[PDB]
Write an enzyme that holds these catalytic residues in place. Structure first.
Site, PDB file in Angstrom:
ATOM      1  N   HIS B 130       0.813  -1.210   0.000  1.00 23.75           N
ATOM      2  CA  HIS B 130       0.000   0.000   0.000  1.00 23.75           C
ATOM      3  C   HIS B 130       0.848   1.262   0.000  1.00 23.75           C
ATOM      4  CE1 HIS B 130      -3.469  -2.500   1.969  1.00 23.75           C
ATOM      5  NE2 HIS B 130      -3.152  -2.915   0.757  1.00 23.75           N
ATOM      6  N   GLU B 192      -8.832   1.490  10.438  1.00 19.93           N
ATOM      7  CA  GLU B 192      -9.230   0.764   9.240  1.00 19.93           C
ATOM      8  C   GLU B 192     -10.710   0.390   9.229  1.00 19.93           C
ATOM      9  OE1 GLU B 192      -6.121  -2.178   9.891  1.00 19.93           O
ATOM     10  OE2 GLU B 192      -5.025  -1.441   8.136  1.00 19.93           O
TER      11      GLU B 192
END
Ligand SMILES: [Fe+3]
Ligand SMILES: [Fe+3]
Ligand SMILES: [Fe+3]
Ligand SMILES: [Fe+3]
Lengths: 388, 510, 166, 388, 510
Positions: B130, B192
């Protein structure tokens, strides 16, 4: 439905015209190179460098950082998110390191993925070709299942030694290299188990349970000092650089290389075992890939640092002496395994010559880089005392 | 002699037995909790198979980017405002991805069960992916977009502005500094699960709406990995649930984690979405309530009730202080436009209607102010005017929360207007809420971040900008702009002529 | 010269540091610096904008001098002041476990950092200390974290309330 | 320019508007599956079949063809572009064949590409690890450079035997498999040279030239009968099916499998040579891959053809016998190679066991499929008659 | 112990020596030439490197298709006319790619030098990749397009119509039946060098113009392999240049190959571009002159001069017959629309203006006819009118050239109108040009292809269609249509009621 409900600015006539109308005649700046301010290690800046260097938000008070000021939230007590206090080594810039293989995530998983699928094809071809027929039964059920199997715990331990480093590394380039060195170790431990599980499928009576190999590792003699060294490297070292350096530039370079290359790679062939060498090929390739990175960080960047070269070499010499003794003990106990082999498999001279190969490679690839005065015959003689 | 092989699950079956016992086998990090030795993980992966599944995603992603999307000139055909928004969205997310690597390395060290370590390890590797993906978005827009400045050097030009400080709090330090469990809550259970998973998707929608198909391609790929991280967060709670320490500290660490994340996201995300776009997708007000209140604070959090987890006690304050938060913040971000690495734009007529329509009272407060500023010539380089001056003229000081780093102007805000000023051992501290204040009072040594006014005090504006490389390649034109048009760009000389000098607002107090 | 990354204060300290050419003098100056310029208990906030950077430069000097002065065993197990690191670590952990409250605990942990932060104490012992001291400090601090009203907490911390809006 | 001068119908407002306006409200047919009319070999139609089956424009007069009429242009004399007259075998449908691995071009090059990249990595790890140090000099400079290298001409010959079939194959599915079978053969041959080229780089006096191994193949005794059989399977056979069947289900299944698996793969390890086995692993994986395809075509499809089952078996049994003799002869000559091995390398008890493995494997995988009644003892006996 | 490896070139250096001498080491195929066995190839590849370079292209391509392009609904937002056009372009090219495999396999067998064999071999594999790629294009439009019929079964539905026969002559039989060298001239020297290489690129241009980004993604990837095939064809000439037979036969096989290829592509390709699209890229007349006269006939053929290669003697003839060729053919294609596997559309107002502008005289001939047919209801099922009836009414016979299979109508054509009819041993033969007439007269047995009128004679139209599965999923609606709108589609019954029965036009001379 047909065209769907959501309208997209790139393809919706009305929206796109609004977008096109707001566009400038040409780019508002001609410097279209992300990371243009990064000092390239090679001729021109690489994609690896652009996508990685400076991702870590270090302030200037951590050598090489471009930000400023303290962290926004620290640990109870005051410890900084990242700080110079987490390692004895010093440098002019923690972002100087470069993985010579220039591996960022994409290239890394791409290659491991190729290896995975090819591994699958190999096993299916190996099983369909019935090559298991020519493997010595004793080697298979005794040395591969128990002793090679026990080694998975060694690699597993070295993998785990990397956990604190993943958290404390002082730069992006070092963190990425470290993460990949650790990931390759867990992969190898898993390939060792993979082989045991494969044998359990093509060989009637073979038990893939890790109970036997684990008992060998935890309570046997052959791997006793190896395990003691691994437990120390992993859990007694709180310095992320001492951990990575001692693991890769001392213990694995000597003990690891001996076991993988001078014992199993060297003897498996003699017992009709082309299976284990297939996986060891991967382990040795990974070992050599890691070495390039390890050398660049500890020797090219830290050991040769323009301001802390002398200091860093002193510390690494210290770490080498600290971990060389436990590593020698590890090799010494492993010597006990030769007495287990069928008579005539190998002799003291081959064993000795193989020890010297490992020691000489280690002196050339690591010791000499920091001026550590290693005495090869003294090391080998210490190890040979373990031969029964 | 039939073609046979071995898969991931077959090897994973024995992974739990990989760890062994020894006296010093224990986490190297300080923690109030004990993660259960037999904790298991949801996905049965081994390194080889993990690399293959990610490798497959990469091919698709980079294939679209290098081939079709490039042929379509997708890097250019995006609304100017959104090209700017992605400079911030992609680079700021990048740091979250990056610090999450260290965070999960710390959790991997914390877990004692081999399977739980393995689950965290997968995330360690995903967060590296990421980091590189977010980097690639900026990399792609710099190489192929309408304005590479900012996209091409955000890693250093982000250090000039105040919005970056708050980002490091929730996405950098909040992820790795503290009890490993407290960090897990900030990252996985809140970060998240509450914000990032829904956020990443929302960004792809706003992106598509504004002509950007680059971000959807990358971010949608990032999203496919999140399921695993969710499970890690969940497993963190399970692993510590049967420990007495849990009942004593879990909900406190969770509440603190929730407030921390929310404090920044609530005003910033909404600001980037509504003020950083041309075409709107949905009002932040409803998006927020659905995300935080419904999806997270209800469905998700209630599933963890069986482990002692309760709804954050500060949830109510968060909602009350949320409604105007982002609107209050854009006034500040625009007033300090010379300190960014992206170009900003005043709301256009059509947008003001949308705002007013969706937030009754918006025009009477913010609407008029923006009209006054444009009348003062805030978009014109020869005006000699920067909105900051207006704040000075109307005696509206801008403070920086010592804990969250979020900028606030209590005298001019429609949302929270609280302000607590304390003096402690020769230093002044300013807080904007009762939760952050407690954090500082109880943990003074965790929050010593110096704010921009403190660091820039007595410095002339153009000098700070020049020193921190806030210029375009011509070495004269500012990266940041008060408008998104292609002409009449402000230069360093235009700012210097303003002769604006920073001062620490707290020094006024005796 | 008043820059962020480069200024007269920083230059002046670089010069002061260049004149520390003895381990004992340099180590003592580092610890004095930490008492004077770090943590919320620092004797002064005058170097707030540059202390983090200056501290690192001072650490560099102490590290370099220590590696030259100490034999290999002492570099691994002795503090820059000649103290046995394990003893100090254990003694400090003992004090932490005897801490009666969170106020006593924070003093122990913070003080430990100011006095022994690496080039002084070997990192291995130091971070082992962080692990242990940080645990107790948190266990004491996070117990009934919200019971004390802000009005009373401000008094306990001992801040001077300058201004309140609500 | 930034926008360019070419306007695209997908993104250009004006053009896209016109396109959208011409679109139907929904698809004009719900059957969105290409190749829906193809009979699935498995549960559901695979991408492999959809993209391959019926690409060849055969008319109905070539069993399975869906087109009608003669070809538009034929050879001088009248021979058809493709015709039944190019092979003795008959079938109800030439499109029945299916590669069990379902390989169309993409998967095929993907796998080989991974192997190429692995390979490069393996060689780099091998050299860096210095594994050449444990390899027997004689086995290297003599059995790898001369005898293994000469075997490349064998594989290269089997490769070329496929040329006519690449031209005459009567269906797409068969043509694709054939091409891949031959492409893998040239690859092997090239991998043999690759190894010699690698050895040339790491072993200072090693010559990579094909001179030596070539002369051995063209004028040696070891491979004399081997080369005779190859030259025949390649240039004396004009029937694409006989060529493919006789090469993969007779010759290479016996002679090839013995040389590769029972000789070099079995003996190389005993000389500290894990390099050659790395490449042989590919050759064997390739062999087993091509085997599933060879079996499906000649046994599953033809040998078991609903109308020509008996007929085809007769022709293949005939072919098996026709080439079984030149193959058995090729082996006998190869036996002479054991005499050149250093004393103690292997004994007749071992070679006899390996020969029975090759023969029994052959009878199990090929012979018994067409009901050719082969006697393992007589074959092994006839071959074994080639020692001292 | 330096990390070392070996590349393709280092192995390829010894490839030429791979082949050895022996009695029967010669081509198995009849040929008048002798390819020198010392011939070398331009690209030094080996199987493994070849696989890698192609695998990388596949990544981009399939990545774009499966991801970004699908998300953009690229398979749908294409002009209806172009969706239909790709059913013909992709599938017809597919056969050329497929037969090219067998062709290069024959050439591989023909070459004696190991390097030349290796060059041809690389093409064998490439053509397999192109076969699958073209198949994938139809597969993707079938799966995600506005009209799957035809795209989903062209492999069998193409056998119904007359256009397919001519395609097989230039792209199937022309590639594999005859002297290997003649085949090479048809495939590589003419087919690829003069038409396909330029054509593939042009197709991506017309596709982009009409909203199709699927074809550009795939065809541009195919294009990247063509350089190897050009070299193969070029090396074919170099291989036989020193053989005396060359000076005696080469220029004749080339001319025949040239006429063969142009005979089909000149009418067909221009027709597919201008009549199978809405948005135009460039008039076919201009394209043709550039491709054939300049680029190929001039530059490319010129470089083969030193090898005794001269411009095809039939060149001038080709240019004279070209101008109206494609326009003349569309009249026949539309008149016989029920025999296709695609949907056709008559030119709209803007298009007729475009045709007249670029082809003075177009409207007075073709334009008026199309308007006459439309007003009469050729697009409407209830009209009972199919343009073929208009040809019968005005006594305008449609013939099939016995050699090229190209349909021609002497009495109506604005282009060539020559017609030669012959009887030989109880069979009639119709020819449209002097070159093909010679071919047949000299090689009777090479050209016995039965035409559609011969096979369908006496059959009622709807029966031929039903028998060959020219129907859509509902089992009643025709795949083929006289318009591209979504309503009023013709059914088998609409055709059956017309009672159209095929007749062999040649019998009128009886
Ligand atoms: Fe992430
Ligand atoms: Fe995540
Ligand atoms: Fe092609
Ligand atoms: Fe081609």
């Amino acid at each position: 439905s047909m065209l769907g409900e959501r309208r997209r600015g790139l393809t919706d006539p009305e929206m796109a015209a609004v977008i096109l109308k707001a566009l400038p005649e040409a780019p508002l700046d001609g410097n279209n190179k992300m990371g243009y301010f990064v000092t390239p290690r090679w001729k021109r800046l690489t994609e690896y460098e652009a996508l990685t260097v400076y991702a870590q938000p270090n302030a200037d008070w951590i050598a090489g950082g471009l930000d400023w000021g303290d962290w926004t939230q620290k640990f109870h007590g005051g410890r900084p998110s990242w700080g110079n206090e987490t390692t004895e080594l010093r440098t002019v810039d923690w972002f100087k390191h470069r993985d010579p293989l220039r591996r960022w995530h994409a290239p890394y998983v791409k290659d491991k993925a190729e290896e995975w699928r090819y591994t699958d094809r190999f096993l299916q071809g190996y099983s369909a070709d019935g090559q298991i027929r020519a493997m010595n039964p004793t080697w298979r059920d005794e040395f591969i299942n128990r002793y090679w199997g026990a080694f998975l715990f060694n690699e597993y331990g070295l993998f785990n030694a990397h956990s604190q480093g993943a958290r404390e590394a002082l730069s992006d380039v070092t963190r990425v290299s470290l993460a990949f060195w650790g990931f390759d170790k867990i992969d190898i431990a898993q390939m060792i188990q993979l082989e045991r599980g494969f044998l359990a499928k093509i060989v009637p009576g073979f038990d893939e349970s890790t109970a036997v190999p684990k008992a060998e590792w935890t309570n046997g003699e052959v791997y006793k000092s190896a395990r003691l060294a691994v437990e120390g490297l992993w859990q007694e070292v709180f310095d992320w650089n001492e951990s990575a350096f001692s693991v890769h530039a001392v213990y694995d370079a000597l003990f690891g290389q001996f076991v993988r290359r001078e014992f199993f790679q060297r003897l498996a062939p003699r017992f009709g075992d082309n299976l284990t060498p297939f996986f060891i090929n991967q382990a040795q390739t990974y070992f050599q890939i890691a070495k390039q990175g390890v050398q660049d960080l500890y020797y090219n960047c830290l050991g040769d640092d323009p301001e802390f070269s002398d200091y860093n070499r002193t510390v690494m010499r210290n770490w080498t002496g600290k971990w060389l003794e436990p590593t020698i003990a590890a090799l010494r106990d492993f010597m006990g395994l030769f007495a287990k082999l069928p008579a005539g498999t190998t002799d003291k001279e081959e064993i000795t010559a193989s020890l010297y190969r490992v020691v000489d490679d280690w002196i050339e690839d690591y010791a000499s880089r920091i001026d550590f005065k290693a005495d090869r015959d003294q090391i080998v003689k210490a190890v040979l005392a373990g031969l029964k | 002699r039939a073609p046979t092989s071995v898969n991931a699950q077959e090897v994973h079956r024995w992974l739990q037995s990989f760890n062994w016992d020894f006296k010093n086998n224990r986490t190297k990090y300080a923690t109030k909790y004990k993660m259960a030795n037999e904790t298991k993980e949801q996905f049965k992966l081994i390194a080889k198979e993990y690399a293959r599944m990610e490798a497959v995603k990469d091919e698709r992603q980079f294939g679209s980017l290098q081939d079709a999307l490039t042929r379509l000139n997708a890097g250019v055909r995006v609304h100017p405002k959104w090209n700017e928004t992605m400079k911030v969205v992609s680079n700021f997310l990048e740091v979250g991805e990056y610090n999450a690597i260290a965070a999960t390395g710390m959790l991997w060290d914390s877990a004692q069960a081999a399977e739980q370590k393995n689950g965290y390890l997968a995330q360690v590797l995903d967060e590296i992916r990421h980091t590189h993906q977010c980097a690639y978005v900026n990399y792609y827009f710099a190489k192929n977009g309408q304005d590479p400045a900012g996209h091409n050097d955000a890693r250093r030009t982000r250090t000039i502005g105040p919005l970056w400080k708050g980002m490091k709090r929730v996405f950098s330090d909040g992820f790795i500094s503290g009890d490993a469990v407290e960090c897990s809550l900030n990252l996985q259970l809140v970060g998240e699960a509450c914000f990032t998973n829904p956020l990443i998707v929302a960004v792809t929608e706003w992106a598509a709406a504004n002509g950007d198909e680059i971000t959807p391609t990358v971010f949608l790929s990032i999203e496919t990995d999140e399921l695993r991280h969710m499970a890690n967060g969940y497993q963190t709670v399970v692993s510590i649930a049967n420990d007495p320490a849990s009942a004593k500290y879990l909900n406190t660490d969770l509440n603190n984690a929730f407030w921390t994340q929310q404090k920044y996201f609530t005003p910033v995300l909404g600001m980037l979405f509504e003020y950083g776009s041309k075409f709107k997708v949905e009002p932040w007000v409803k998006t927020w309530d659905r995300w935080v209140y419904e999806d997270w604070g209800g469905i998700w959090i209630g599933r963890l009730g069986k482990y002692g987890v309760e709804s954050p006690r500060s949830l109510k304050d968060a909602k009350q202080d949320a409604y105007w938060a982002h609107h209050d913040l854009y006034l500040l971000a625009y007033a300090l436009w010379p300190t960014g690495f992206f170009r900003l734009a005043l709301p256009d007529q059509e947008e003001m209607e949308w705002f007013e329509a969706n937030y009754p009272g918006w025009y009477d407060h913010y609407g008029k102010i923006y009209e006054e500023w444009r009348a003062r010539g805030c978009e014109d380089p020869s005006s000699g005017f920067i909105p900051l001056m207006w704040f000075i003229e109307n005696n509206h000081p801008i403070y920086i929360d010592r804990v969250s780093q979020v900028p606030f102007c209590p005298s001019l805000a429609k949302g929270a207007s609280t302000l607590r000023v304390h003096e402690y051992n020769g230093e002044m501290h300013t807080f904007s809420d009762q939760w952050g204040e407690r954090m500082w009072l109880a943990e003074p040594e965790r929050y010593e971040c110096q704010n921009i006014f403190e660091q820039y005090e007595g410095r002339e504006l153009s000098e700070v900008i020049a020193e921190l490389h806030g210029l375009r390649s011509d070495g004269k034109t500012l990266i940041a702009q008060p408008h998104v048009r292609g002409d009449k760009l402000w230069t360093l000389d235009d700012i210097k002529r303003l002769n604006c000098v920073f001062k620490n607002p707290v020094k006024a107090f005796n | 010269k008043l820059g962020i990354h480069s200024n007269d204060t920083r230059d002046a300290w670089v010069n002061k540091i260049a004149q520390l050419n003895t381990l004992e003098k340099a180590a003592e100056m580092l610890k004095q610096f930490r008492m004077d310029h770090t943590t919320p208990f620092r004797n002064s906030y005058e170097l707030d904008n540059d202390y983090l950077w200056i501290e690192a430069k001072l650490e560099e000097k102490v590290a370099v001098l220590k590696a030259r002065a100490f034999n290999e065993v002492d570099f691994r197990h002795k503090t820059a002041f000649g103290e046995d690191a394990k003893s100090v670590l254990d003694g400090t952990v003992a004090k932490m476990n005897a801490a009666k409250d969170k106020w006593e605990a924070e003093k122990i942990h913070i003080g430990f950092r100011q006095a022994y932060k690496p080039p002084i104490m070997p990192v291995n012992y130091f971070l082992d200390g962080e692990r242990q001291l940080g645990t107790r400090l948190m266990e004491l601090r996070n117990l009934n974290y919200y019971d004390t009203p802000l009005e009373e907490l401000r008094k306990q911390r001992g801040v001077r309330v300058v201004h309140l809006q609500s």
